[PDB]
Every structure is written in structure tokens, then in C-alpha cells.
Design a protein around this ligand. Structure first.
Ligand SMILES: CC(C)(COP(=O)(O)OP(=O)(O)OC[C@H]1O[C@@H](n2cnc3c(N)ncnc32)[C@H](O)[C@@H]1OP(=O)(O)O)[C@@H](O)C(=O)NCCC(=O)NCCS
Ligand SMILES: CC(C)(COP(=O)(O)OP(=O)(O)OC[C@H]1O[C@@H](n2cnc3c(N)ncnc32)[C@H](O)[C@@H]1OP(=O)(O)O)[C@@H](O)C(=O)NCCC(=O)NCCS
Ligand SMILES: CC(C)(COP(=O)(O)OP(=O)(O)OC[C@H]1O[C@@H](n2cnc3c(N)ncnc32)[C@H](O)[C@@H]1OP(=O)(O)O)[C@@H](O)C(=O)NCCC(=O)NCCS
Lengths: 537, 78, 537, 537
């Protein structure tokens, strides 16, 4: 197959390469360091006042529970960044997937250090986003419960609604019914709300003289028919292991508690149901590092996508479909760490033939049960008068139908720009790809900065035009200023990962290995057959 | 079994090879399944009662065949 | 298992032996030589006029596309032998089963040299019998298209009816729906009819400045409202790869085109669905060429079929069911190249007992999902007055329901004579055996030559006797003359295989080799449970 | 719904109108009187020699068997018309659908008068096509057995191949297994072949001193090991009813036999499986006979098909889809005698737009499980240099994948011309429409008369031109003249219907009543959900 090879056209030594690769690497270091700040949790401050109580820290608990040197894919680490008034580190909940007794598991634990471990609106959002990845990929769950309650001041966005707290219990009882084990490890307070996480769980573990599961803690209980009782007596470790039966395992401390936990995942009789014709893994043909310089620094500067392709696929072998047709979208088959995959990567605009090309590809992929890989870098659909009269509307629709209905495993990664209709036609957040990721250089928004200020301000002088007046360059310019800056702000990865519009910002030169981890993980769940809606011909 | 088996005619195997710097599309049509067998790194030839064994072994997309002192390499055309 | 052994009774050195063997090996050489003639195509003549155009010949495209040294089972090569006036070798279409990137595949391509590759009646029937085998056994399909049109002169037997052209597209889109990939490589003209073969196929490949897909070629298009255009501008390779979208891969030539196709079969993520308890493959206990002398030369001469069985099963191991009952039908289990098979071979007549024995066996075979092997050498059912008043009718019916309803893979080989009711009770052409073959010695007819000339002339003298007279040896002999010879001609393998009444004539001593290939190839598709109709007890 | 109304634009009194209606009704009376000829059977001659035996005639046994006054839809009456040397009325077997004990049943009985009832090649194709209609539409079966054997002179096209005789038994045992009762009433000779028809059927009835089921009648049995016995002693009515068990009911004679038969269908515990939301049946808005004048007399004369639609649907209400797009194909919803139907009638040529229009429509009905009705009047697809480079190829193809895959009841009526790719894209014979009918004014061929003479003679002067010659007005006029007429003749309804390329030629004026009957009949069998192949976008 020395024909399906992608021979590069990039010189790793060029000056222009070193230029891109430069500001790229900076971007990455930018992320690097932030992610470190977030590792601190509630700051050395109470974080140390934690270990004080003889409690192991969050991320420490995770590394102890994991398998010796197992990898760990973390989710939305930039969670709640510069979102709430105060600093709410990774939204006060660290979640990720990792090997635990030879099983790819979904793990979630609260950072008791971050504002008392309570649930801010996004803590809930992150928690629930985890149970999704969990139900969607059949990964058993391990809840390392150590939370206050729900953040009392912002309850309006934390208690009522459908996808608000309590939907945690919903997904939970449903996961235990669809046979995805629900394991609970209580290592702190667990008053009211989170009191159900361990109550509603196949198996539950408590740390003595530290764990506490009660509906109303002593503050609330005293505020009841008086009564003043201590934590340990109301709902301590010994009360629910020897008396009520809300817990199942009596652990002597944080380290014991996790060890007990491992054991549960051990008697799972678990077996993966995914199924692909995976082939032996063979590395790419170009250092995945070289990606740093393939991606231009000048945001709207044309580059060839196949370059990024050649540095992620196995042996940089890639067989291209409708090779020379609506080339704006590149489509092909290849393998990634064994797992075969079908790719759809943007390469520009997106005329009508590009979506018919892509919709036709998704049919072949969905017909062979091969995973889908979307690489977004779309600026939008070519507009025009003949273009619109040509059905760039209905054909675009053709694409989205195919994407929205495709039931094989979908994976998306933003390496350019998610803008307008494009985001949807390329499996954007709303199409439930098993995982959605974002590169440091990529920006997302309904449409360009000035693009929106363009129209938004245009109409203002169209309504003010047939109103016997006109828009003076003084008011129009004050109409666009606020927009031109807003857009630039909410188009940035941090802003995005901060609100969970993606499961995290990643290292461009690490992509290949993230995809392998994911793909494999999603094979814990059967590749279901696909049923398409009506295609608007 | 890549023996080139066929319905009623003889075993057919068309090979698009290349040794030195001259490609040849070899047509292998043997009705008498003999001629050259090969075990380990050695090609055994039953050249009319007089069996002889010349070394040959492959590595990657290349096969080395010691033919008359020389050690020529043959590989597949693309 | 040193007892389920078949110890031969044949003396390989015997004079009588080499006797039969003589004329047997002679018939085989008769076939060997015609087949060779058929590989000529439209004859050296235009065959060279073909390579003239820089186009690889059909049988060559085939060998270049196959796995290095892979086997190839051809389909009805004697197709249309001496059928139409002219000589249309292998019906202007070659097709068979062979490995392509490790998948047992169905390949069909037209011989541009044979009367312009146009579709003669039997061409269409051949092309469809290929897609039966492909749907029946779930084998991906590669059509190497290079045909003229449909043979205009005989359109009434090529265009309309269900079984005609156009059922080619029907079968295509149905297969595509059933998930049996559909690939097309156009390497020549492809006007009107064949124009849909590429258009209706998951993936399509074209040779530039050679291929051409247009509904109406220049002849017919000038015949429209004038207009005079070249073939390549009308529907060239460049037109349908850069502009229209009726093609997907842009090939530089026949060799490229074929290697391009391989790659498509490569990412098929294909897996076999069949599944038996196959075991270590062990060879016969007697050389399979010994057969040539096992089969007597005097057509009406009895021999023991268990002799042809000992030269096909593994280790000539055969456990016989209802050993000594209705002996006219031998029944037993064995293995063939690993794969376990249930055999049913004729040993003479076929009294009621042989049918009951045969029905009860199929039942066992069907309940254990063991494939079926039928060895046809039946002359008919035993007649008479007490034989009929004994239910030979109903009983023979019991064997027919069982065969018709049996849903595990069935395989028939004609090793003697297929005559009358026998042909049906023994899985004939009409009971959909996956594959059905014929030896050079076997003859198929509704009844023997004179046997039918018997009745036919008989009533002629009974309608003429209750009419006041009779048939004199003068007119009665002139009524049996024609029949006697017509039957001898319509019963010969070449006459049969020409009309596809079978998937070809084979070398008696290769029988085993074909069967294993066949079996394996039908495991590409699942062995379904079986449901019987009502059994008239 | 006073808007879904189709107001006519034709004048019933116009002269141009009575013009067409004239030549139309002339054709229908031509068919009418031909049909009467065929109801004669083997001519007054033998026919009477039949009733002499005390045997009820075929078409009589039928009317006796049906429910008082029930309708009867005959199948291919013009069967084998001017096909065999001699005359073989309705191909020696009458078949059709009629109510028996309140169940829509498929009935087939042979005409012992026609060449001794023996099976000529087409007699087999008929019997078989009948069991297809029976399988596909889940109608129990009544076989009124009274045949000789198989037309011995023409055995080569009656015994061997897949869909030859013997495929009868196949279909039977299968239908018997899918729970579709198989009944048999033997009212005459039944030697050899047809010996299974009663042997292999759930319930069986014989007429005493008249029915005879034996594998070898006495002609055959004397030519066996001597012995001479009578017909009734060998396998009479009393042999198989008291001794063997090949039959189940002892009938006194024809009238009795059919009454016994009625009773079986009586205890079938039968229930219909289809299910549509049909409404109260309301008649058209314009006399159905007005069609005669709707159809222009000049075959190549453009007219509006809605006018024929208006005369078939209920209340002449028709809701049109993509009203004004690719108007060449009209599509819409309506009802017909209650039952809801989706229509597709040709109106001219057929460029890309029309196909997409039609594929998108099929999607909609396939999704709501509404039956499909195709009205063929297609001359072909629009040819051209641009029309080709635009995908008129791949677009016509989306249409057929759609048609071929549709699993709701498909219905076809030829009211114009079936030519070329047109026939396929409009559910032609090859797409399994449950039933396919022809008007007497409609003509079918792979292409027009001279259109084929155009190209077949064209290449003759291009082969002979790049050959240093040219074809003079005298050799090219002699290559075209025979083709010019060959097509005219092999295009006529009788030509068609005689070969079963349709289930009959009908009365333009009764179309609606036939379709009503068919639909209902097709509802004895469930409406399947549909799975589409890949659509080449
Ligand atoms: C959870 C709890 C045991 C904390 O124990 P602790 O380890 O001693 O932690 P502290 O009391 O020091 O709490 C420190 C932080 O927790 C925050 N906090 C705790 N519970 C909170 C709540 N429900 N809402 C908002 N903030 C809360 C406080 O705002 C405080 O913030 P600060 O560090 O910036 O000053 C205690 O706050 C408690 O009993 N809360 C009950 C929560 C509840 O009843 N929730 C019901 C709603 S589901
Ligand atoms: C197919 C075609 C391109 C041939 O190209 P080519 O490689 O130059 O081959 P030639 O033109 O030399 O054809 C030679 C033979 O083809 C035969 N032939 C080609 N098309 C034929 C057809 N449709 N019907 C009958 N014969 C045909 C000719 O009879 C000729 O026979 P001959 O060698 O005994 O004299 C050309 O015949 C053509 O354009 N035909 C179109 C076919 C068509 O329109 N069919 C539609 C029906 S669905
Ligand atoms: C069928 C049979 C009983 C006819 O009884 P019948 O009502 O007296 O009718 P007749 O014998 O007068 O038959 C008249 C016609 O039947 C035709 N016929 C009958 N069986 C035929 C057969 N098997 N093949 C060809 N023609 C046959 C004769 O050609 C004759 O034609 P004709 O009128 O032009 O001279 C008698 O022909 C018979 O016994 N046939 C057995 C058929 C058989 O054994 N076929 C086995 C093949 S599956």
C-alpha cells in the first residue's frame, strides 16, 4: 500500500515553519501553565488545611486508585475558568477516564478544597457531562464523594431544571439498570444533595471517622425540631456500615477506601462489546510534533489539511474518497493505533458538492461500522445568489442529517474555526460526538467578530433609513465596537472549555494519542447500526 | 493457499516484480506443481533428477536471491 | 476413529480401472482444451486490436487485481457455448471468486473484445447469477465495467422481464442496503445500460482518457436534437471526477485503476459471519485422481459411490447414518478441509425408504447447522403398482420439502445422472444450492432418450388406436428418431453449462478442492436456523 | 378538501376527443374479442371431448369454486400468444385471484384441453409467476390439478434451471412453511411432475374414477420392468385415499371436489396482515370511461397525465408534492377506494430534477407505509453534453435505489411507453412491483424503432469508415429496415403479455377497479419497513 501514503510538502527547517511552530508552542505553554494553576485546587491555603484532617487530596486519590502507571484522560480541566466571581478550580470536580483493574473507567471526585466542594452550576454540568461519556461509552463509574452541598447562593441554576443536580441520580439509576456498575467511595461530608450519590449506587464505601452521609447535617437538623447532635453520630461511618445499611464497605482511611474500591471493579465480570477489525498499530511517518509548524500563525491563512492527517494516522497511509471533487472537504479512510477510522476534515469554504461528498462518505462509513473523525476548520458556507439558488441550502442539510443520525462512534476536534452552519455540519457539540476537543489555536463563534457587527449594525441603519434618517459614522462605530470585542472574547478556547462546550483543550501534537485512548474507550460499548432520516434530495 | 489454483487449467500467478532496475510481469503457469519449493532461507530446485539448493530469503518488501555468486534483490512494482 | 474409515475396494492397477480412467481423463482433456479456446475472447483478432488501445485484457485485469497467487473459482465459462449464431466466448463476461486484500470477493468484468462486450441474453443471466452467489454468501462485489450496450438485435430477451438487465441494478442497490459493499471500475465505454453499474455503487473508479459513463453516447446523442460531441467530452473520466460526481477515484490507467480498487476493499472493515466447528484440515486417504477410474465408463453401469466419498472427505473418515436402510441413498457425516459437512449421495434407484432416510438426515443436518453436500447420480424413483400404492409419492415429497426448506449452505455436484424427480429431491438447480457443479461424464435430462421417445410415440399410437387403426413401424420409428437424438444432445454438460443450468463443469479429481473453496466462501455469510413446511406423513 | 380537487380541462364532447376515444375503444374491443378466443381452450374440438369424460371445464371449476358473485382478476390471459408453433390458449393454465370463503385466494388450474394440459415453457413461467404473487401478497393457494406432464419435446426449457418446473415444489414447501396454506384438488391425470403438486400440499382432494397421482403412469411403467396395469389401479382416487395417504379427501366428482375445497379454506383461521389507515371509499369525479378520450391517439403526442389521475383517485382529490419542480414527473398523495396511495406518473422526459423529486417522494411514502403507484409513459432521460456532465446519470440512479429498496406495496400500470432507463426508474417488471399491468395503447422496448436502427446501422458505417470505406444508401437501408419492424412488433402488448412481462393487458377504463382489487389483496400481507441502499449524492 505504498500508494496510500501522504508524502509531506512541509520543510521542518524552513523559517516560516519555525515561525508558526513558534507562536503555536507558546500557545501550548500558555495552556500548560494554567493547567498547573488549576492543579492547586482551592490554593495551598485550605488545600493544606485538608491533608490536615488526614484526608488525601483529590488528584492524589485518583492516582492511587488508578492502575500502576495507567494513563488518565482528564475532562474539561479549564472548567469554570474566570466564570464565577471567585476562583472555582476545575469547577471543584475532577473527572476523567482511566484503567482500574483492566477496565477503562469513568472517575469523578470532588475537590473538598474548592469552595467547600459544593456544587456551583458548572460543577453540576461537568458531573453530568461525565455520566454522558459514561453511558455513551459504557464505562463503569467510580464516584469519589467528598462534597459540601450545592452552592446555596446560585441554587436557581443548580437545583430545579431537567439537566440540573438530581439528574445525577437520574442518569445513575438508569446506568445501573442498563448494567453499567455504579461504585461509590465516600471520603468526606456528604450532606443532603450528594447524600444520594452513595445511597443510589450498586456498591458504596465509607472512610471511618471522616465519611458522613446524612440528609440534613447538624446545621439543618438543629434548625429542625431543635436537637443538637454531632456529625459522627447523625450519619457517620459506623452508623451506615453497622446500622442502616446505606454503605457496604467499612474502610479505615482514604488509602484503604480506594483499595476496597479497586476490588469492586475487580469482580465486575466485565467484557467489552465494541467490535472493529483493528489491525496492528504502526506509528505515523512524521513526528506528531511537527504539527506545531504545519498550522499557520495567521488565523485566516490557507494550509493543507492532509498535512495534519499525515501526522496522526497509522503509517501516514490515507485513502481519499471523491479525491478531486468539492475539495473544500477532504474525506478518507485510514487507521489510528489499529482502530480503523473514517475522516472528514475541512479544507476551506464549503460549496454544495462538498456536503454531498461528505454525506455520501458518512453513508459508506456508517455502512461498514467504522468510527467517524471530524476535524473542524470551517469558516462557513459559500454564499451568493447563484449559490443559494443552487441548493447550497438543501445539500448542506443532507450533510447534517447524515451526521446527526450516524450512530457509529463520532469524534470531533477543533483545529481551526468553528463558525456558523459549519460547526453543525461537522459534528459540533450538539451532535453528541462521543468526545469533542479543542486545539489552542482554534476559535469558535456563530460568525466572525466584525461579520456580526457588520449585519447587527447594518440593520440599525436600515430601520433608521426608511425612518427618514441615516446612521452617522459616530453612532455606527459605537454600535460595532462592543461587538467586535465581545466576539473576540467568547471565541477563545479557555472561554469555551470553561463552559464545557468541549471536553477540554489539548496539545495539538498529542492529538493522535488522545484519539487512540478515546476510540479504544468507546469500544466498551457496541457499535450500533445506523438509521437515516429522510434525505432532502 | 496462494498456489494460484484454478478451475481446470493450471495454477496461474501473475507477479508484477522488479530486480536490479528492470521490471517484469512474471507469468507463473505450472501444471506440474513441482519446480521450486522453499523452506527456511532456501530455495530447492528439482532440475531433472539433479536437486540443488540455493539460498534466498526475504526482508520487508524486498527478497534476496543468491543467484550465481551475486546476491540480487527483487521487490514489488507499485 | 480408526473405524469411520473407508477402506477402498478398487484396484488402481486393474485393467478395467485404467479402462474407465482412460475415457474419463479423455473427457477432461476435451474440457481443458475448450476452456483454453474460450480464453481467446473475441479471438486474437480484435483481442490484439484491444491491447492496441492501451487497455489490459479482461482476464488480465482479473489476475492483476487478485491477491498475489490467490486461487480463483470461475463461473460458467462454457457460458453460451454454441448458443447464439456467432461465437460469444464465456458470454462476453468473466466472473468468479477470489481473494482481494484478504476478502473472498465476487469479480465481474466484460470482455470488450467479444462482440463489443455488449449484453447478450446469457450475458445478463450470467451477470445476475454472479450477484446471487454474492448476495447468497455475502461476498463484496467488484464490477470491472468495460461494455458496449445491450445486444440490440435480441433486446426482447435482454431488456424487459424481471430476470433481465435492470435486475442488475435492483440486485445492486439491495445488496448495498444489506451491507455488501458495491465497487465499480470503469475501464472502457459504458453507454446507456451499463451506465448505471458505476452510478449505483458505493465506490467508483475511472481510467482517464479511456473510461466514459454517459446515458446516451455520441451516436444516440446526435440522434437527439442534433448535437455532435466527442465521447470524452460527453461523459469522460475528467467529467465525472471533477465536475459531475458520478465517479470517485481518478485512475491513470488499467493497472492504477485496479490497485485503486484493492485499496477500497482494504478499508472494508470486513468480517465473516459464518461459523462452524471446523477442525484441523486432514487430506484424503487415497489420491483424488484415483477417481478418474472409479467412475465406470458405461453410463448405465453400477458402482459404489462410497468410493468417490473416500476420495473427498478428510482422512476418508465417514460415519454412516441409517447404514443399511434404503441403501439406494447413502447418508453420512464427515469433514472436508476442516469444515464439517453432511453428505447425501445416490447409490442407484430411490425407493420410498431412501427418501425417508434422506429427510430424517437433513433434519439432523439442519438442527446442527452442518452444511449439505449432494452427489447426484440418480436415474429416478422406482415405479410399479405396489410401489405407488405405497406412497413413493408422498415419501419422495418428504425429502423435497426438507431440501427446499433447509437453510444451511447446500452444495450439489452432478457425478452421474440427473434424471427426473431425482434432480429435485437431490438439491437440483431449482432448490438454490449455494453452488452446483457438473462432471464431464454426467448427463441431465427430464428422462432418458428413448424413455421419453417411448411415451411420446406411445400415446401417438393410442390416440390413433381408439381412432380405428394403429401406428406402423414406419411412422412410429419416424416419431422416435428426433427425440432420441435431441435428448442425447440436450443432456450433455456443454449444453447445460452454456445456459448456466450449473455454475460450470469441473475436473472430477479437483472436486474436493472446489468444495473446500466454496464452503469457506459461503461462511462469509451466516448459517440461518431452518424452518420446515408441513411434512405429509 | 375542496382545493385538492383536480378540475378537468378536457371536453368530452370535443371532436379531437371522440377521435382518440374512438381508436382507443377500437383497441379494447380488439383485446376483448381476442380474450374470448382464448376462453375457448383447446378449441370446441377437444374441449367438448373433455365434458364428455364428465369433467367440468377449467374456467368452470373456477367460477363454481369462487364465492357467489365474487370478482376474479385473471393473470396473463394472452399467455403464450402466437409464441409456440401451434395454439396454446392462456398457456394451458388459468390463474387469478378470487374470494373463496371470505379469503382473497390465488387459484391455478390447468386446461386439460390445451395440448393435453402438458407444461409448455411458458406454462411453467405462469404457474410460477402465480406463486410469486401468492408469496409476496400472502394469499393461500388452491391448485386445481388436471395436467399431463411436461411438454416433452421442449423439456430443455421446462426441466433444469432454477426457475423451471420443480421450482413449483420449491415455492410450495416454502410457502407452506411461512404459513400460507397450500391446497390441492386433483381432477384428472397427474403423472410424473405434477405428481408432487398434490403430494406436497397441506390438504389434498381427489375425484374418484378420474383423479390419478402416480410417479410413472402406465406408459412409463410398462416401459419399466414390463408389467401392464390400468391407470386407476396404479394410482387412482381410491388407492391414494384408503391405502397410501397421498390425498386427504375422497371427492365424488368435480362439483363435489370443489365444495370439499371450499371447506378447507373455511377452517383456515385466516386473518389479514397488512394495515393502512383507509377511509370511506368515494368515487372519482369524472366517469372512468372518459379516459378513452384522454389518451391522444398519436403515440408521440404530449398530454397531461393529471387527467388520468383525476379519473382514478377518490373524489379526484390529489395533493401534489414538489408541485412545480422537474415537472416531467408528477407526484402526489390520494386515496383509491379507501386505501391511501402515493403516485408517480410520468409527464414527458425526465431530467435530473425529476428523479430527485421522485426519490425524495418515495422516501416520504416509504416512511409512512403508504403504497406506491407508478404510471409509466416514459420516453427516456434527457440526453445532452451538459445534461450528462451535470449528473443526469447519478441522479437517475438515486431514483432506482429508492424504487428498488421500497418495501411497501409497489404497483405499476403502463399507460404510455416503457423505453430505456425509464422503465427501470419507474418500477418496471424487474423491480418486483406486487402487480404490473399494461394498457393496449402502450408500447415497451429497450428503445424506439428507428432509434435502435439509428445506432446499430450507425456504428456499421464508422467501423467501415475508419476502414477506408463508407456504407452506401443501399447497404445501410438494408441493415435498418428489418430492425425498424422487429421493434414495432416486439413492442406490442400482446407480444409483452404473451411472455408474462406483465400480469396482463387491461381496459384503460377499469384501471381504478383493478388497482382497488390488487391493493386489498396485497393487504393479506404486512407492510414492511424499508431499508435504503447507499445514495450516491
Ligand atoms: C459542607 C460543610 C460541612 C463545610 O465543612 P468545612 O469542611 O468545615 O468547610 P467550611 O465550613 O470551612 O466551608 C468553607 C466554604 O464552604 C462554603 N459553603 C459550604 N456549604 C455551602 C453551601 N451550601 N452554599 C454555599 N457555600 C457553601 C462557604 O461559602 C465557605 O466559603 P469560604 O471558604 O470562601 O469562606 C458545611 O458548610 C455544611 O454543613 N454545609 C451544609 C450544606 C447544605 O446543607 N446544603 C444543602 C443544599 S443541597
Ligand atoms: C460499444 C461501441 C463503443 C463499440 O466500440 P468499439 O470498441 O470501437 O467496438 P466496435 O464499434 O468495433 O464494435 C464491433 C462490434 O460491436 C457490435 N455492437 C456494438 N454495440 C452493439 C449493440 N448495441 N448491439 C449490437 N451489436 C453491437 C457490432 O455489431 C460489431 O460487430 P462486428 O465486429 O461483428 O462487426 C459502439 O458500438 C457504441 O457506441 N455502441 C453503443 C451501444 C448502445 O448504445 N447500446 C444501448 C443499449 S442498452
Ligand atoms: C397426459 C395423457 C394422459 C393425455 O391424456 P388425454 O386426455 O387422452 O390426452 P391425449 O393423450 O389425447 O394427448 C393429446 C396431446 O397431448 C400431448 N402430450 C401429452 N403428454 C405429452 C408430453 N409429455 N409431452 C408432449 N406432449 C404431450 C400429445 O402431443 C398430444 O398432441 P396432439 O393432440 O397434437 O396429437 C397422456 O399423454 C400421458 O399418459 N402422458 C404422460 C405424460 C408423462 O409421462 N410425462 C412425464 C414428463 S414430466
Amino acid at each position: 500500500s505504498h500508494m496510500a501514503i501522504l508524502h509531506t510538502q512541509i520543510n521542518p527547517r524552513s523559517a516560516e515553519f519555525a515561525a508558526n511552530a513558534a507562536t503555536m508552542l507558546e500557545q501550548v505553554n500558555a495552556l500548560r501553565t494554567l493547567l498547573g494553576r488549576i492543579h492547586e485546587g482551592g490554593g495551598s491555603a485550605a488545600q493544606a488545611r485538608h491533608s490536615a484532617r488526614g484526608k488525601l487530596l483529590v488528584r492524589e486519590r485518583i492516582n492511587r486508585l488508578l492502575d500502576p502507571g495507567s494513563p488518565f484522560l482528564e475532562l474539561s480541566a479549564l472548567a469554570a475558568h474566570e466564570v464565577y466571581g471567585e476562583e472555582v478550580a476545575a469547577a471543584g470536580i475532577v473527572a476523567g477516564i482511566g484503567r482500574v483493574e483492566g477496565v477503562e473507567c469513568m472517575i469523578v471526585g470532588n475537590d473538598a478544597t474548592v469552595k467547600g466542594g459544593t456544587y456551583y452550576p458548572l460543577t453540576v454540568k461537568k458531573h453530568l457531562r461525565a455520566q454522558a461519556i459514561a453511558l455513551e461509552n459504557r464505562l463503569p463509574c467510580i464516584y469519589l464523594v467528598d462534597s459540601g452541598g450545592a452552592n446555596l447562593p446560585r441554587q436557581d441554576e443548580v437545583f430545579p431544571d431537567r439537566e440540573h443536580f438530581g439528574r445525577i441520580f437520574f442518569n445513575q439509576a438508569n446506568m445501573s439498570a442498563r448494567g453499567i456498575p455504579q461504585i461509590a467511595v465516600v471520603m468526606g461530608s456528604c450532606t443532603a444533595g450528594g447524600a444520594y450519590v452513595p445511597a443510589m449506587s450498586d456498591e458504596t464505601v465509607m472512610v471511618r471517622e471522616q465519611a458522613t452521609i446524612f440528609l440534613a447535617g447538624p446545621p439543618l437538623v438543629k434548625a429542625a425540631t431543635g436537637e443538637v447532635v454531632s456529625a459522627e453520630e447523625l450519619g457517620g461511618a459506623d452508623v451506615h456500615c453497622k446500622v442502616s445499611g446505606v454503605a457496604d464497605h467499612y474502610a479505615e482511611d482514604d488509602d484503604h477506601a480506594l483499595a476496597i474500591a479497586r476490588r469492586c471493579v475487580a469482580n465486575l465480570n466485565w467484557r467489552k462489546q465494541g467490535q472493529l477489525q483493528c489491525r496492528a498499530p504502526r506509528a505515523p511517518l512524521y513526528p506528531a510534533e511537527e504539527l506545531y509548524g504545519v498550522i499557520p500563525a495567521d488565523s485566516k491563512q490557507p494550509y493543507d489539511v492532509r498535512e495534519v492527517i499525515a501526522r496522526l494516522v497509522d503509517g501516514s497511509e490515507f485513502d481519499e474518497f471523491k479525491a478531486l471533487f468539492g475539495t473544500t472537504l477532504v474525506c478518507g479512510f485510514a487507521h489510528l493505533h489499529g482502530y480503523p477510522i473514517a475522516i472528514l476534515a475541512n479544507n476551506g469554504i464549503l460549496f454544495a458538492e462538498a456536503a454531498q461528498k461528505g454525506a455520501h462518505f458518512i453513508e459508506l462509513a456508517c455502512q461498514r461500522g467504522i468510527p467517524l473523525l471530524f476535524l473542524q476548520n470551517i469558516t462557513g458556507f459559500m454564499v451568493g445568489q447563484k449559490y443559494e439558488a443552487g441548493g447550497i441550502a438543501k445539500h448542506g442539510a443532507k450533510l447534517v442529517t447524515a451526521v446527526a443520525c450516524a450512530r457509529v462512534p463520532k469524534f470531533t476536534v477543533l483545529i481551526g474555526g468553528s463558525f456558523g452552519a459549519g460547526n453543525y455540519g461537522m459534528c459540533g457539540r450538539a451532535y453528541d460526538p462521543r468526545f469533542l476537543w479543542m486545539w489552542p489555536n482554534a476559535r469558535i463563534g456563530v460568525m466572525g467578530g466584525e461579520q456580526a457587527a457588520g449585519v447587527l449594525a447594518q440593520v440599525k441603519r436600515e430601520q433608521a433609513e426608511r425612518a427618514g434618517q441615516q446612521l452617522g459614522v459616530e453612532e455606527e462605530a459605537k454600535i460595532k465596537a462592543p461587538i467586535l470585542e465581545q466576539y473576540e472574547h467568547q471565541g477563545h478556547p479557555y472561554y469555551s472549555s470553561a463552559r464545557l462546550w468541549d471536553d477540554g483543550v489539548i496539545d495539538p501534537a498529542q492529538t493522535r494519542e488522545v484519539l487512540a485512548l478515546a476510540l479504544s474507550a468507546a469500544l466498551n460499548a457496541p457499535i450500533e447500526p445506523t438509521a437515516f432520516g429522510v434525505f432532502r434530495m | 493457499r496462494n498456489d494460484g489454483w484454478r478451475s481446470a487449467l493450471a495454477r496461474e500467478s501473475d507477479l508484477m516484480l522488479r530486480c536490479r532496475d528492470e521490471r517484469r510481469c512474471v507469468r507463473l503457469r505450472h501444471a506440474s506443481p513441482s519446480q521450486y519449493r522453499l523452506d527456511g532461507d532456501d530455495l530447492v530446485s528439482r532440475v531433472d533428477g539433479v536437486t540443488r539448493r540455493s539460498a534466498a530469503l526475504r526482508r520487508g518488501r524486498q527478497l534476496f536471491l543468491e543467484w550465481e555468486g551475486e546476491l540480487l534483490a527483487i521487490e514489488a512494482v507499485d
